[PDB]
Design a protein around this ligand. Structure first.
Ligand SMILES: Nc1nc2c(ncn2[C@@H]2O[C@H](COP(=O)(O)OP(=O)(O)OP(O)(O)=S)[C@@H](O)[C@H]2O)c(=O)[nH]1
Ligand SMILES: [Cl-]
Ligand SMILES: [Mg+2]
Ligand SMILES: [Mg+2]
Length: 436
């Protein structure tokens, strides 16, 4: 029940669930993971390794080079790819060993993957190892590091500034700056670029292509959302942490708002700080943070969305998987409330995979009996659901040649929270889709 600090071969026998909680940068992904894979191959286990992002998967594929590891014999895939396969009639192999790296990731597909895995372990069908420096319930924002970190609470700019904050731009090294949202990041990055800094911006939808730029010498700032908490490695000297995040909230079961900016969890703060202090021979790394931490409330939509996913994943006859027990208190929905019949469930998965809609929104459309290609719901909502861009109602040319105001029947604030998200939703509402 208690987390461990070293891998032991008896962790690979069925019904064992082990949390490996070495401090950030202690060598979990880099040194303990290849040891586990060797022992699994030696014992003929059917194994899957789950990476948080394809960036990290590509990294592990090279560190595991020379072993029989199939990137999608040991299978390698991302959390989202794993949960995605569980949602198709492509009934997944019955692995008897699941290794989940960066097991703290709180996106809905990762929460659902932990629930499925822990249920298989409790069924006695598998063993599992969750690797993370910050397991659920963590209340330490300042864990150990390979080199000592200088922690300082300071006022962190939340918008562009025309004077002051000289300590930001006088720094000579490399800084990673965590922001609560893409739109806040755009404003900070433009202000740094105007000061002559070379800035890379990272978000969940640009991470793959833009993270590559960080592997070079010629940058001063990375401005990033919380996606960089999931095992992203930088060569940086300083982290600036707003200590804030946005929280998706389902108001009354009828809409999703983005609440905040509000304090991050202790686990998030520790992972942000854990981007630096990683070189044991390089003292002096600095963590500058702008406020306190707070634990997640009852109302974070990601855990409810995870139940929407798990209610639609096959397990064994009529069974439905539970959430991983330290996470199971966050949701009030009851097992099975979100189960869909076969055809609506196909629409549900299509809206998420092909439409890039948030889980909650894809469920509302699918359970309404709307088919994937029917976009009338994007335009027939109430007036309060009108989507604005630069303070004017957004309009779209539909597939049928009419210009309509964007006014979805169900409002999820995440489809219009930044320029790239709105562009994608406008294309979806028009019956179009940009080349993947
Ligand atoms: N990318 C990379 N990192 C290296 C290398 N040699 C040493 N390191 C350092 O060793 C650290 C430990 O690697 P890793 O296995 O990621 O620790 P970890 O416990 O997984 O760190 P955590 O953030 O996810 S909680 C790396 O993050 C990096 O700082 C190298 O050749 N490549
Ligand atoms: Cl993001
Ligand atoms: Mg790691
Ligand atoms: Mg150590």
């Amino acid at each position: 029940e208690t987390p461990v600090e070293c891998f032991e071969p008896s962790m690979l026998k069925k019904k064992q669930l082990t949390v490996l909680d070495l401090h950030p940068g202690a060598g979990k992904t880099r040194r303990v993971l290849p040891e586990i894979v060797r022992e699994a191959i030696k014992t003929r286990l059917r194994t899957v390794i789950l990476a948080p992002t394809r960036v990290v998967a590509a990294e592990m594929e090279e560190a595991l080079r020379g072993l029989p590891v199939r990137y999608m014999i040991v299978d390698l895939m991302c959390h989202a790819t794993f949960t995605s396969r569980l949602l198709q009639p492509i009934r997944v192999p019955n692995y008897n060993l699941y290794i989940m790296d960066e097991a703290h990731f709180t996106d809905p597909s990762s929460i659902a993957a932990r629930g499925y895995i822990s249920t298989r372990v409790e069924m006695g069908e598998a063993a599992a190892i969750f690797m993370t420096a910050t397991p659920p319930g963590t209340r330490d924002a300042f864990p150990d590091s390979n080199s000592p970190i200088m922690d300082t609470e300071v006022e962190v700019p939340e918008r562009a500034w025309s004077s002051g904050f000289d300590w930001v731009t006088d720094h000579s090294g490399k800084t990673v700056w965590f922001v609560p949202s893409v739109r806040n990041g755009n404003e900070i990055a433009a202000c740094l670029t105007k000061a002559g800094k070379r800035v890379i911006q990272l978000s969940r939808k640009t991470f793959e292509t833009e993270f590559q730029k960080t592997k070079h010498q010629e940058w001063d700032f990375v401005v990033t959302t919380d996606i960089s908490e999931m095992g992203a490695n930088f060569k940086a000297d300083r982290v600036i942490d707003s200590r804030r995040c946005l929280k998706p909230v389902i108001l009354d079961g009828e809409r999703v708002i983005l609440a905040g900016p509000m304090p991050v969890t202790h686990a998030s703060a520790a992972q942000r700080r854990g981007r630096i202090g990683r070189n044991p021979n390089k003292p002096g790394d600095e963590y500058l943070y702008g406020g306190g931490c707070a634990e997640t409330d009852e109302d974070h939509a990601h855990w409810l969305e995870a139940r929407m996913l798990l209610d639609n994943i096959y397990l064994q006859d009529g069974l439905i998987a539970s959430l991983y027990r330290p996470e199971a208190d966050k949701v009030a929905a009851i097992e099975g409330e979100f189960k869909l019949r076969t055809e609506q469930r196909k629409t549900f998965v299509e809206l998420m995979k092909r439409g890039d809609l948030p889980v909650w929104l894809a469920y509302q459309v699918a359970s309404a009996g709307i088919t994937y290609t029917d976009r009338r719901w994007c335009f027939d909502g109430t007036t309060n659901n009108t989507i604005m861009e630069d303070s004017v109602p957004a309009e779209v040319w539909t597939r049928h040649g009419e210009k309509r105001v964007l006014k979805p029947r169900w409002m999820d604030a995440r489809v219009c929270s930044d320029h790239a998200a709105l562009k994608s939703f406008k294309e979806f509402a028009a019956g179009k889709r940009a080349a993947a």
